[PDB]
Design a protein around this ligand. Structure first.
Ligand SMILES: [Ca+2]
Lengths: 197, 553
């Protein structure tokens, strides 16, 4: 049994995927991505999983330790296993589509192998649902949802109190790192929505 | 990241317009990727970062959407109490618990592999330890365990056909991300999405709390607490990473504040100037906001005040005059290496002086440093991301505002000196530095323009292209890494976007780049855009290639 995917590219080379089922739809999406941005994606995977030193050496050790130290793979693999099947096909499909194109590259690498792989001297990896999940987790969640400076703040506060005494050390800190400022320009009118809790 | 939408009330020649400008830095290949998914319940066209299954910037023919980073606070630090004889055993809810752990092995090119251990407690991953106080800090995230469900609410909102269907996905998106809605009927909406802890009363979310259990989150706040609006009275919705709503608490980050001074006013002001905006007017605000110096609007009025009473030939008045007469809109000189107006260089030097004189005097080293930057700290390559009023400048503004600022100035930033004295003094210093750096004849001052680079290293510092495989743009634009303009009209939907350098980053082993390797660079620089095709009949004329895949299942 098989399914048919159609990939039409426009004047700017943008891929438009046509499929009749989720797994096929994303498989075509992943395939077009491997065609267009394979090296970018391969390094995004090593960036979100901390395996850059593998191909670039010692300079990246700290980076890798750091990346791996900030996520728990077990949690991710489990969440994926918990997703409904149609949603699992989204990731698995994309992963397979990527791999199908890597297959063509290995067919005629003299023409299809992105030059960066040749010059950096390494090969395209095998993609999984976990690899696809992590691209987002590492560039989205860990980018706009993992910021925090509470330990430093503790040091800021400690240093203010030391300088101004406990009461004033504390008031200075709320003066310069307030919880909220009622006069901040906001996206919603206070009438329409004012925050509570 | 900014965005602005107008509904049926303010849209002109359209039912709703949405202009989104996500900011991530500039890279080669491009940060985002264009795509159209057609079939199996999907009908989407747009562009999205890293080609994620979820299309962040786009529409489905019925509903268009976009986003900006939320900066709410859904991540707290727990100071775990470590056993004095087992750093991997911690006290929680009455029990001395063993930390979860795992060994990670790093292959390292040219060296023997290295293995190290990673620990995790009941609150999140151990992020730092302080042995002196038997502490192991751990990071608790309100979105931990909800990553995939959030990614999926993210692909599913793309299939939403109405506001209620879209809210049903927004409620399941747990990262602090602002989401925007516009639809074929002229309805517009906004939701600051994310899961926020229901914290123990008195838990300061800005500092660590003990992880022995008494301070554990009670739960996760209900979606009803999340700031949201549907068809605002104002007729528009704009955001440039500003606060969602009054009293909404931002992240604990010391560097990030939602204060009186906020870049979003550059957007609101421009929109309010029109009664109804066409998609072209909307795009006009993009060019304006990309070039407007953010500190000009805020600071000049104080400059005017402090120098009132000085004669016209006074030096600090020469400066203030140049600024009062400026519209704030920077322009590239004819050689492309300079600005036609010296205003930014003035505001920059002045601000740096002011800050050393205020926060630089009141905030003890080395934290003063968190407040000394003017926000213009550019590079050879240009800013790595968007430009904003700095942490120091927002704090300085808050103070200059005096009684107009609702924040009590427990410490007088000015240390008792009249603020206009300090302003006058620092202006006089600014004038001399300008004179000494740019020459005696102000008419011949040639201040450096800020450039922009499409870097070969991703936002992580990781090469994603060959060395020097980058692109330079003379004029920096404080705009989204990509821009997409979506319009619901009587006819349907017309949309456009720009993904520079191009759709493809391919270069054959031979060294031949794809034809789409950089066909969008000039488009970016010139403030152009290319069409976003959704349906087959209108994409048809433009199809340059077709590939059919029969996949074995
Ligand atoms: Ca926090």
């Amino acid at each position: 049994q098989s399914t048919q995917i159609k990939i039409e590219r426009d004047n700017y080379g943008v891929p438009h995927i046509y499929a009749n089922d989720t797994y096929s739809l994303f498989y075509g999406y992943g395939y077009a991505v491997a065609q267009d941005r394979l090296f970018q994606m391969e390094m995004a995977k090593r960036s979100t999983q901390g395996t850059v030193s593998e191909v670039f050496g010692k300079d990246y050790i700290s980076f890798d330790k750091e990346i791996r130290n900030n996520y728990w793979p077990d949690s991710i693999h489990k969440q994926i296993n918990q997703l409904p099947s149609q949603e699992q096909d989204i990731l698995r499909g994309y992963a397979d589509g990527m791999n199908a194109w890597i297959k063509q590259i290995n067919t005629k690498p003299d023409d299809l192998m992105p030059k960066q792989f040749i010059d950096y001297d390494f090969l395209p990896s095998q993609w999984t649902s976990f690899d696809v999940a992590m691209i987002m987790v590492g560039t989205l969640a860990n980018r706009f949802s993992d910021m925090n400076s509470e330990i430093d703040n503790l040091a800021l506060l400690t240093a203010l109190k030391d300088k101004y005494g406990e009461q004033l050390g504390v008031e200075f800190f709320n003066q310069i790192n307030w919880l909220n400022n009622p006069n901040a320009p906001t996206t919603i009118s206070s009438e329409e929505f004012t925050y509570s809790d | 990241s900014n965005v602005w939408l107008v509904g049926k009330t303010k849209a002109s020649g359209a039912k709703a317009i949405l202009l989104n400008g996500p900011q991530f830095g500039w890279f080669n290949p491009a940060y985002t990727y264009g795509i159209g998914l057609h079939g199996a319940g999907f009908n989407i066209v747009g562009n999205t970062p890293f080609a994620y299954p979820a299309i962040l910037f786009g529409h489905n023919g019925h509903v268009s959407w976009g986003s900006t980073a939320g900066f709410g606070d859904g991540v707290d630090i727990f100071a775990e109490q470590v056993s004095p004889e087992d750093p991997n055993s911690y006290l929680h809810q009455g029990q001395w618990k063993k930390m979860l752990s795992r060994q990670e092995t790093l292959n390292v090119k040219g060296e023997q592999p290295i293995t190290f251990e990673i620990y995790r407690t009941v609150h999140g991953n151990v992020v730092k330890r302080d042995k002196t106080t038997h502490t192991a800090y751990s990071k608790a995230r309100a979105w931990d365990g909800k990553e995939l469900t959030s990614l999926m609410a993210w692909v599913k909102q793309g299939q939403a056909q109405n506001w209620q269907q879209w809210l049903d996905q927004a409620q399941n998106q747990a990262l602090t991300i602002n989401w925007y809605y516009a639809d074929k009927d002229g309805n517009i909406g906004y939701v600051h999405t994310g899961h926020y802890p229901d914290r123990q009363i008195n838990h300061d979310p800005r500092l660590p709390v003990s992880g022995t259990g008494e301070w554990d989150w009670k739960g996760i706040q209900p979606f009803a607490n999340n700031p949201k609006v549907y068809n605002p009275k104002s007729g528009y919705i704009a955001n440039w990473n500003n606060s969602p709503a009054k009293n909404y608490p931002a992240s604990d980050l010391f560097a990030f504040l939602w204060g009186s001074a906020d870049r979003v006013k550059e957007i609101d002001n421009r929109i309010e100037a029109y009664d109804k905006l066409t998609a072209d007017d909307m795009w006009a605000i993009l060019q304006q906001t990309s070039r407007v110096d953010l500190n000009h609007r805020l600071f000049t009025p104080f400059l005017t005040q402090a120098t009132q009473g000085l004669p016209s030939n006074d030096n600090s008045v020469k400066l203030v005059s140049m600024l009062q007469q400026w519209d704030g809109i920077n322009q590239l000189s004819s050689d492309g290496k300079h600005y036609i107006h010296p205003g930014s260089a003035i505001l920059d030097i002045w601000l740096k002086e002011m800050l050393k004189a205020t926060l630089g005097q009141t905030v003890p080293a080395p934290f003063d440093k968190w407040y000394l930057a003017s926000g213009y700290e550019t590079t050879q390559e240009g800013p790595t991301g968007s430009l904003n009023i700095s942490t120091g400048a927002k704090l300085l503004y808050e103070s200059l505002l005096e009684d107009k600022s609702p924040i009590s100035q427990s410490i007088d930033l000015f240390s008792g000196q009249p603020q206009n004295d300090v302003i006058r003094k620092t202006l006089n210093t600014t004038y001399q530095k300008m004179i000494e750096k740019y020459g005696d004849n102000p008419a011949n001052w040639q201040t450096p323009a800020t450039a922009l680079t499409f870097r070969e290293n991703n936002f992580f510092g990781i090469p994603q292209a060959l060395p020097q495989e980058n692109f330079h743009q003379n004029e920096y634009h404080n705009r989204g890494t990509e821009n997409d303009l979506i319009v619901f009209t009587e006819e349907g939907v017309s949309a456009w976007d720009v993904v520079a350098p191009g759709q493809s980053g391919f270069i054959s082993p031979q060294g031949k780049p794809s034809p789409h390797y950089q066909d969008q660079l000039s488009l970016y620089q010139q403030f152009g855009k290319k069409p976003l095709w959704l349906n087959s009949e209108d994409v048809a004329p433009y199809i340059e290639s077709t590939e059919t895949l029969i996949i074995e299942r």
